[PDB]
Amino acid sequence: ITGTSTVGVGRGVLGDQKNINTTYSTYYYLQDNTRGNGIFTYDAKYRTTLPGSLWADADNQFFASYDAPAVDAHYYAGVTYDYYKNVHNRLSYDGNNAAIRSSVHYSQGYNNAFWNGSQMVYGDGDGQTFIPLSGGIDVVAHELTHAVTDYTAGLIYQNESGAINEAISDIFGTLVEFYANKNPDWEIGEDVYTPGISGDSLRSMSDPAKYGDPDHYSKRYTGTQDNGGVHINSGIINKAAYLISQGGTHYGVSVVGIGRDKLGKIFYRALTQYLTPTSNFSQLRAAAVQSATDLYGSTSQEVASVKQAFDAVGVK
Numbered sequence: 001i002t003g004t005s006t007v008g009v010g011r012g013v014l015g016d017q018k019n020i021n022t023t024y025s026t027y028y029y030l031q032d033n034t035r036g037n038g039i040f041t042y043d044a045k046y047r048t049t050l051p052g053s054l055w056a057d058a059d060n061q062f063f064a065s066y067d068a069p070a071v072d073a074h075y076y077a078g079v080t081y082d083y084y085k086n087v088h089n090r091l092s093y094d095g096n097n098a099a100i101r102s103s104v105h106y107s108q109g110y111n112n113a114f115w116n117g118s119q120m121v122y123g124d125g126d127g128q129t130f131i132p133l134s135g136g137i138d139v140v141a142h143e144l145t146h147a148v149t150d151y152t153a154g155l156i157y158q159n160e161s162g163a164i165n166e167a168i169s170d171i172f173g174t175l176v177e178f179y180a181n182k183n184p185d186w187e188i189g190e191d192v193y194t195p196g197i198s199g200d201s202l203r204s205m206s207d208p209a210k211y212g213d214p215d216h217y218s219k220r221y222t223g224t225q226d227n228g229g230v231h232i233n234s235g236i237i238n239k240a241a242y243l244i245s246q247g248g249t250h251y252g253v254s255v256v257g258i259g260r261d262k263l264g265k266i267f268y269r270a271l272t273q274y275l276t277p278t279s280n281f282s283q284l285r286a287a288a289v290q291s292a293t294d295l296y297g298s299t300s301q302e303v304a305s306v307k308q309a310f311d312a313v314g315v316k
Protein backbone atom coordinates (compact mmCIF):
# COMPACT_ATOMS: atom_id res chain seq x y z
CA ILE A 1 0.00 0.00 0.00
CA THR A 2 1.05 3.62 -0.47
CA GLY A 3 1.83 5.30 2.82
CA THR A 4 4.60 6.51 5.08
CA SER A 5 7.17 4.29 6.78
CA THR A 6 6.65 3.88 10.51
CA VAL A 7 8.13 1.84 13.36
CA GLY A 8 5.81 -0.26 15.50
CA VAL A 9 6.52 -2.33 18.59
CA GLY A 10 5.32 -5.78 19.52
CA ARG A 11 5.92 -9.15 21.11
CA GLY A 12 6.80 -12.33 19.28
CA VAL A 13 5.76 -15.95 19.80
CA LEU A 14 8.31 -16.49 22.62
CA GLY A 15 7.29 -13.31 24.47
CA ASP A 16 10.19 -11.12 23.38
CA GLN A 17 9.72 -7.46 22.47
CA LYS A 18 10.97 -6.14 19.11
CA ASN A 19 10.50 -3.16 16.81
CA ILE A 20 8.93 -3.79 13.40
CA ASN A 21 8.89 -1.69 10.24
CA THR A 22 5.30 -0.79 9.31
CA THR A 23 3.48 1.52 6.88
CA TYR A 24 0.82 4.05 7.89
CA SER A 25 -2.20 4.82 5.72
CA THR A 26 -5.33 5.00 7.95
CA TYR A 27 -4.13 1.76 9.56
CA TYR A 28 -0.62 0.59 10.35
CA TYR A 29 0.25 -2.31 8.03
CA LEU A 30 2.94 -4.98 8.33
CA GLN A 31 4.76 -3.58 5.31
CA ASP A 32 8.49 -2.92 5.73
CA ASN A 33 9.65 -0.47 3.06
CA THR A 34 13.26 -0.41 4.29
CA ARG A 35 14.28 -3.65 2.53
CA GLY A 36 14.19 -4.05 -1.25
CA ASN A 37 10.71 -3.71 -2.72
CA GLY A 38 9.15 -4.47 0.64
CA ILE A 39 8.38 -7.20 3.15
CA PHE A 40 4.64 -7.80 3.52
CA THR A 41 2.93 -9.93 6.16
CA TYR A 42 -0.66 -11.19 5.81
CA ASP A 43 -3.37 -12.70 8.03
CA ALA A 44 -4.75 -15.98 6.66
CA LYS A 45 -7.40 -15.97 9.47
CA TYR A 46 -7.23 -19.74 10.10
CA ARG A 47 -8.21 -20.48 6.49
CA THR A 48 -6.29 -21.90 3.55
CA THR A 49 -6.99 -19.17 0.96
CA LEU A 50 -3.75 -17.25 0.29
CA PRO A 51 -2.38 -14.77 0.91
CA GLY A 52 -5.27 -13.44 2.99
CA SER A 53 -5.37 -9.78 3.98
CA LEU A 54 -2.35 -7.50 4.46
CA TRP A 55 -1.98 -7.26 8.23
CA ALA A 56 -3.70 -4.08 9.51
CA ASP A 57 -3.47 -2.69 13.04
CA ALA A 58 -5.10 0.43 14.50
CA ASP A 59 -2.31 1.68 16.81
CA ASN A 60 1.08 0.30 15.65
CA GLN A 61 1.39 -1.80 18.86
CA PHE A 62 1.45 -5.57 18.37
CA PHE A 63 1.21 -7.15 21.86
CA ALA A 64 -1.92 -9.27 21.42
CA SER A 65 -1.51 -13.04 21.40
CA TYR A 66 -3.02 -13.11 17.88
CA ASP A 67 -0.31 -10.66 16.72
CA ALA A 68 2.69 -12.72 17.85
CA PRO A 69 3.14 -14.99 14.79
CA ALA A 70 2.87 -11.99 12.49
CA VAL A 71 5.45 -9.98 14.45
CA ASP A 72 7.98 -12.81 14.11
CA ALA A 73 7.28 -13.73 10.48
CA HIS A 74 7.75 -10.06 9.57
CA TYR A 75 10.82 -9.43 11.75
CA TYR A 76 12.64 -12.68 10.89
CA ALA A 77 12.01 -12.16 7.17
CA GLY A 78 13.88 -8.88 7.63
CA VAL A 79 16.79 -10.61 9.36
CA THR A 80 16.97 -13.19 6.57
CA TYR A 81 16.90 -10.45 3.92
CA ASP A 82 19.76 -8.74 5.76
CA TYR A 83 21.80 -11.95 5.89
CA TYR A 84 21.54 -12.56 2.15
CA LYS A 85 22.26 -8.92 1.29
CA ASN A 86 25.08 -8.24 3.76
CA VAL A 87 26.82 -11.62 3.63
CA HIS A 88 26.22 -12.79 0.02
CA ASN A 89 25.41 -9.54 -1.82
CA ARG A 90 22.04 -11.04 -2.84
CA LEU A 91 19.01 -8.73 -3.07
CA SER A 92 15.98 -10.76 -1.95
CA TYR A 93 15.24 -14.28 -3.14
CA ASP A 94 15.35 -13.48 -6.87
CA GLY A 95 18.46 -11.28 -6.70
CA ASN A 96 16.44 -8.24 -7.89
CA ASN A 97 14.68 -7.23 -4.64
CA ALA A 98 11.40 -9.13 -5.18
CA ALA A 99 8.81 -8.28 -2.55
CA ILE A 100 8.80 -10.87 0.24
CA ARG A 101 5.32 -12.03 1.28
CA SER A 102 4.35 -14.22 4.25
CA SER A 103 0.99 -15.38 5.62
CA VAL A 104 0.45 -16.46 9.23
CA HIS A 105 -2.48 -18.15 10.96
CA TYR A 106 -2.69 -20.58 8.04
CA SER A 107 -5.31 -23.29 8.56
CA GLN A 108 -6.14 -24.79 11.98
CA GLY A 109 -3.70 -26.83 14.04
CA TYR A 110 -1.24 -26.77 11.13
CA ASN A 111 2.13 -28.30 12.15
CA ASN A 112 4.16 -27.01 9.20
CA ALA A 113 5.42 -24.07 7.19
CA PHE A 114 6.21 -23.85 3.47
CA TRP A 115 7.06 -21.78 0.42
CA ASN A 116 4.16 -22.23 -2.02
CA GLY A 117 6.03 -21.07 -5.15
CA SER A 118 5.21 -17.40 -4.47
CA GLN A 119 5.18 -16.73 -0.71
CA MET A 120 5.91 -18.11 2.74
CA VAL A 121 3.13 -19.72 4.78
CA TYR A 122 3.13 -20.52 8.53
CA GLY A 123 0.82 -22.68 10.57
CA ASP A 124 0.05 -22.01 14.22
CA GLY A 125 0.82 -25.59 15.22
CA ASP A 126 -1.50 -27.68 17.36
CA GLY A 127 0.10 -26.43 20.59
CA GLN A 128 1.63 -29.85 21.32
CA THR A 129 3.96 -30.72 18.43
CA PHE A 130 4.48 -27.06 17.40
CA ILE A 131 3.65 -23.54 18.52
CA PRO A 132 3.33 -20.93 15.74
CA LEU A 133 6.17 -21.79 13.43
CA SER A 134 7.32 -18.27 12.56
CA GLY A 135 8.67 -18.15 16.14
CA GLY A 136 11.77 -19.96 14.87
CA ILE A 137 14.32 -17.85 13.03
CA ASP A 138 15.82 -21.01 11.54
CA VAL A 139 12.32 -21.94 10.29
CA VAL A 140 11.69 -18.54 8.66
CA ALA A 141 15.13 -18.60 7.01
CA HIS A 142 14.56 -22.24 5.95
CA GLU A 143 11.39 -21.16 4.13
CA LEU A 144 12.88 -18.09 2.43
CA THR A 145 15.84 -20.21 1.37
CA HIS A 146 13.46 -22.47 -0.58
CA ALA A 147 12.66 -19.38 -2.69
CA VAL A 148 16.39 -18.69 -3.17
CA THR A 149 16.94 -22.30 -4.26
CA ASP A 150 13.98 -22.19 -6.65
CA TYR A 151 15.32 -19.04 -8.35
CA THR A 152 18.89 -20.37 -8.58
CA ALA A 153 19.79 -24.09 -8.73
CA GLY A 154 16.13 -25.06 -9.02
CA LEU A 155 16.63 -28.40 -7.29
CA ILE A 156 13.68 -30.68 -8.00
CA TYR A 157 11.87 -31.59 -4.77
CA GLN A 158 12.34 -35.36 -4.77
CA ASN A 159 15.04 -37.99 -4.16
CA GLU A 160 18.65 -36.74 -3.91
CA SER A 161 18.10 -33.33 -5.53
CA GLY A 162 15.24 -32.78 -3.07
CA ALA A 163 17.36 -33.83 -0.08
CA ILE A 164 19.99 -31.29 -1.22
CA ASN A 165 17.19 -28.70 -1.50
CA GLU A 166 16.18 -29.49 2.09
CA ALA A 167 19.75 -29.42 3.40
CA ILE A 168 20.39 -26.05 1.74
CA SER A 169 17.36 -24.67 3.62
CA ASP A 170 18.56 -26.19 6.94
CA ILE A 171 22.14 -24.94 6.36
CA PHE A 172 21.14 -21.35 5.61
CA GLY A 173 18.40 -21.45 8.24
CA THR A 174 21.16 -22.27 10.74
CA LEU A 175 23.59 -19.69 9.37
CA VAL A 176 20.87 -17.01 9.67
CA GLU A 177 20.25 -18.17 13.25
CA PHE A 178 23.97 -17.69 13.96
CA TYR A 179 23.91 -14.31 12.16
CA ALA A 180 21.20 -13.05 14.53
CA ASN A 181 23.19 -14.64 17.40
CA LYS A 182 20.35 -15.49 19.81
CA ASN A 183 20.78 -18.99 21.25
CA PRO A 184 22.32 -20.30 18.01
CA ASP A 185 22.78 -24.01 17.48
CA TRP A 186 23.01 -26.70 14.79
CA GLU A 187 19.48 -27.98 15.54
CA ILE A 188 16.38 -27.23 13.43
CA GLY A 189 13.16 -25.77 14.85
CA GLU A 190 13.96 -26.09 18.57
CA ASP A 191 12.32 -22.76 19.47
CA VAL A 192 8.86 -23.81 18.23
CA TYR A 193 8.94 -27.61 18.58
CA THR A 194 7.24 -29.55 21.42
CA PRO A 195 6.70 -26.88 24.08
CA GLY A 196 6.29 -29.61 26.70
CA ILE A 197 9.66 -31.28 25.99
CA SER A 198 12.95 -29.45 26.59
CA GLY A 199 16.14 -29.97 24.65
CA ASP A 200 14.72 -31.53 21.48
CA SER A 201 14.25 -30.34 17.91
CA LEU A 202 12.81 -31.47 14.59
CA ARG A 203 16.23 -32.34 13.10
CA SER A 204 19.84 -32.16 14.21
CA MET A 205 22.65 -31.23 11.85
CA SER A 206 25.37 -32.09 14.37
CA ASP A 207 23.91 -35.58 14.96
CA PRO A 208 21.09 -36.37 12.49
CA ALA A 209 20.73 -39.88 13.87
CA LYS A 210 19.40 -38.46 17.16
CA TYR A 211 16.04 -38.23 15.35
CA GLY A 212 16.44 -41.26 13.07
CA ASP A 213 17.89 -39.43 10.09
CA PRO A 214 20.91 -40.87 8.26
CA ASP A 215 24.41 -39.52 8.86
CA HIS A 216 26.07 -41.63 6.16
CA TYR A 217 25.15 -42.40 2.54
CA SER A 218 25.02 -46.13 3.31
CA LYS A 219 22.01 -45.40 5.56
CA ARG A 220 20.04 -43.43 2.96
CA TYR A 221 16.32 -44.00 2.56
CA THR A 222 15.17 -45.05 -0.91
CA GLY A 223 11.44 -45.56 -0.47
CA THR A 224 8.71 -43.23 -1.68
CA GLN A 225 7.54 -41.50 1.51
CA ASP A 226 8.31 -37.79 1.90
CA ASN A 227 9.06 -37.30 -1.83
CA GLY A 228 11.72 -39.97 -1.57
CA GLY A 229 12.99 -38.94 1.86
CA VAL A 230 13.78 -35.26 1.26
CA HIS A 231 13.56 -34.42 5.00
CA ILE A 232 15.34 -37.70 5.92
CA ASN A 233 18.29 -37.93 3.52
CA SER A 234 18.97 -34.24 4.13
CA GLY A 235 20.73 -35.51 7.26
CA ILE A 236 23.62 -36.83 5.15
CA ILE A 237 24.31 -33.38 3.68
CA ASN A 238 23.55 -31.55 6.94
CA LYS A 239 26.17 -33.73 8.64
CA ALA A 240 28.71 -32.96 5.91
CA ALA A 241 28.03 -29.23 6.29
CA TYR A 242 28.34 -29.43 10.08
CA LEU A 243 31.68 -31.24 9.71
CA ILE A 244 33.04 -28.69 7.22
CA SER A 245 32.26 -25.88 9.66
CA GLN A 246 32.98 -27.46 13.05
CA GLY A 247 35.24 -30.42 12.33
CA GLY A 248 35.21 -33.85 13.92
CA THR A 249 35.97 -37.51 13.34
CA HIS A 250 32.97 -39.39 11.98
CA TYR A 251 33.05 -43.13 11.16
CA GLY A 252 36.80 -42.87 11.64
CA VAL A 253 37.30 -40.04 9.09
CA SER A 254 38.79 -36.84 10.51
CA VAL A 255 37.63 -33.44 9.24
CA VAL A 256 39.41 -30.16 10.01
CA GLY A 257 36.77 -27.50 10.59
CA ILE A 258 36.98 -24.21 8.69
CA GLY A 259 34.14 -22.30 10.38
CA ARG A 260 30.62 -21.15 9.54
CA ASP A 261 31.46 -18.19 7.33
CA LYS A 262 33.52 -20.27 4.91
CA LEU A 263 30.87 -23.00 4.94
CA GLY A 264 28.32 -20.39 3.91
CA LYS A 265 30.53 -18.98 1.15
CA ILE A 266 31.21 -22.44 -0.29
CA PHE A 267 27.60 -23.58 -0.26
CA TYR A 268 26.23 -20.24 -1.53
CA ARG A 269 28.61 -20.41 -4.49
CA ALA A 270 27.76 -24.06 -5.13
CA LEU A 271 24.02 -23.27 -5.04
CA THR A 272 24.24 -20.26 -7.35
CA GLN A 273 27.01 -21.23 -9.80
CA TYR A 274 27.25 -25.03 -10.05
CA LEU A 275 24.13 -26.93 -8.97
CA THR A 276 21.31 -27.68 -11.41
CA PRO A 277 17.75 -28.91 -10.95
CA THR A 278 18.77 -32.60 -11.07
CA SER A 279 22.06 -32.51 -9.10
CA ASN A 280 22.68 -35.59 -6.94
CA PHE A 281 24.85 -35.92 -3.84
CA SER A 282 27.99 -36.80 -5.82
CA GLN A 283 27.44 -33.72 -8.00
CA LEU A 284 27.01 -31.59 -4.86
CA ARG A 285 30.39 -32.82 -3.63
CA ALA A 286 31.95 -31.80 -6.94
CA ALA A 287 30.18 -28.42 -6.83
CA ALA A 288 31.42 -27.76 -3.27
CA VAL A 289 34.98 -28.81 -4.19
CA GLN A 290 34.96 -26.48 -7.20
CA SER A 291 33.45 -23.64 -5.16
CA ALA A 292 36.10 -23.97 -2.44
CA THR A 293 38.76 -24.11 -5.16
CA ASP A 294 37.45 -20.85 -6.70
CA LEU A 295 37.34 -19.11 -3.32
CA TYR A 296 40.45 -20.46 -1.56
CA GLY A 297 42.70 -22.30 -4.05
CA SER A 298 43.18 -25.93 -5.02
CA THR A 299 45.85 -26.53 -2.35
CA SER A 300 43.84 -24.88 0.44
CA GLN A 301 42.72 -26.38 3.73
CA GLU A 302 39.19 -25.42 2.73
CA VAL A 303 39.24 -27.73 -0.31
CA ALA A 304 40.85 -30.52 1.72
CA SER A 305 38.18 -30.22 4.42
CA VAL A 306 35.31 -30.32 1.90
CA LYS A 307 36.73 -33.61 0.59
CA GLN A 308 37.15 -35.12 4.07
CA ALA A 309 33.60 -34.13 5.09
CA PHE A 310 32.01 -35.80 2.07
CA ASP A 311 34.29 -38.81 2.60
CA ALA A 312 33.09 -38.95 6.22
CA VAL A 313 29.44 -39.24 5.10
CA GLY A 314 30.19 -41.72 2.33
CA VAL A 315 29.65 -39.43 -0.68
CA LYS A 316 32.20 -39.74 -3.49
Ligand SMILES: CC(C)C[C@H](NP(=O)(O)CNC(=O)OCc1ccccc1)C(=O)NCCCN
Binds near residue numbers: 112133146157
Ligand atom coordinates in the same frame (compact mmCIF):
# COMPACT_ATOMS: atom_id res chain seq x y z
C1 LIG B 1 11.65 -26.16 9.16
C2 LIG B 1 10.38 -26.95 9.45
C3 LIG B 1 9.77 -26.47 10.77
C4 LIG B 1 9.38 -26.80 8.31
C5 LIG B 1 9.81 -27.53 7.02
N1 LIG B 1 8.79 -27.27 6.02
P1 LIG B 1 9.20 -27.29 4.39
O1 LIG B 1 10.39 -28.23 4.22
O2 LIG B 1 9.50 -25.92 3.83
C6 LIG B 1 7.72 -28.00 3.55
N2 LIG B 1 7.76 -27.62 2.16
C7 LIG B 1 7.23 -28.38 1.09
O3 LIG B 1 6.65 -29.39 1.28
O4 LIG B 1 7.49 -27.81 -0.14
C8 LIG B 1 6.90 -28.38 -1.27
C9 LIG B 1 5.82 -27.44 -1.82
C10 LIG B 1 5.92 -26.87 -3.09
C11 LIG B 1 4.93 -26.02 -3.55
C12 LIG B 1 3.82 -25.74 -2.76
C13 LIG B 1 3.73 -26.30 -1.49
C14 LIG B 1 4.72 -27.14 -1.04
C15 LIG B 1 9.94 -29.01 7.34
O5 LIG B 1 10.97 -29.53 7.65
N3 LIG B 1 8.74 -29.76 7.28
C16 LIG B 1 8.72 -31.17 7.62
C17 LIG B 1 7.46 -31.49 8.43
C18 LIG B 1 7.23 -30.60 9.65
N4 LIG B 1 6.02 -31.06 10.33
Ligand SMILES: [Ca+2]
Binds near residue numbers: 061
Ligand atom coordinates in the same frame (compact mmCIF):
# COMPACT_ATOMS: atom_id res chain seq x y z
CA1 LIG C 1 -2.51 -2.96 18.00
Ligand SMILES: [Ca+2]
Binds near residue numbers: 184185
Ligand atom coordinates in the same frame (compact mmCIF):
# COMPACT_ATOMS: atom_id res chain seq x y z
CA1 LIG D 1 18.54 -21.89 18.70
Ligand SMILES: [Ca+2]
Binds near residue numbers: 138177185186187189
Ligand atom coordinates in the same frame (compact mmCIF):
# COMPACT_ATOMS: atom_id res chain seq x y z
CA1 LIG E 1 18.23 -23.86 15.46
Ligand SMILES: [Ca+2]
Binds near residue numbers: 199200
Ligand atom coordinates in the same frame (compact mmCIF):
# COMPACT_ATOMS: atom_id res chain seq x y z
CA1 LIG F 1 10.62 -28.93 22.59
Ligand SMILES: [Zn+2]
Binds near residue numbers: 142146166169
Ligand atom coordinates in the same frame (compact mmCIF):
# COMPACT_ATOMS: atom_id res chain seq x y z
ZN1 LIG G 1 12.05 -27.38 3.60
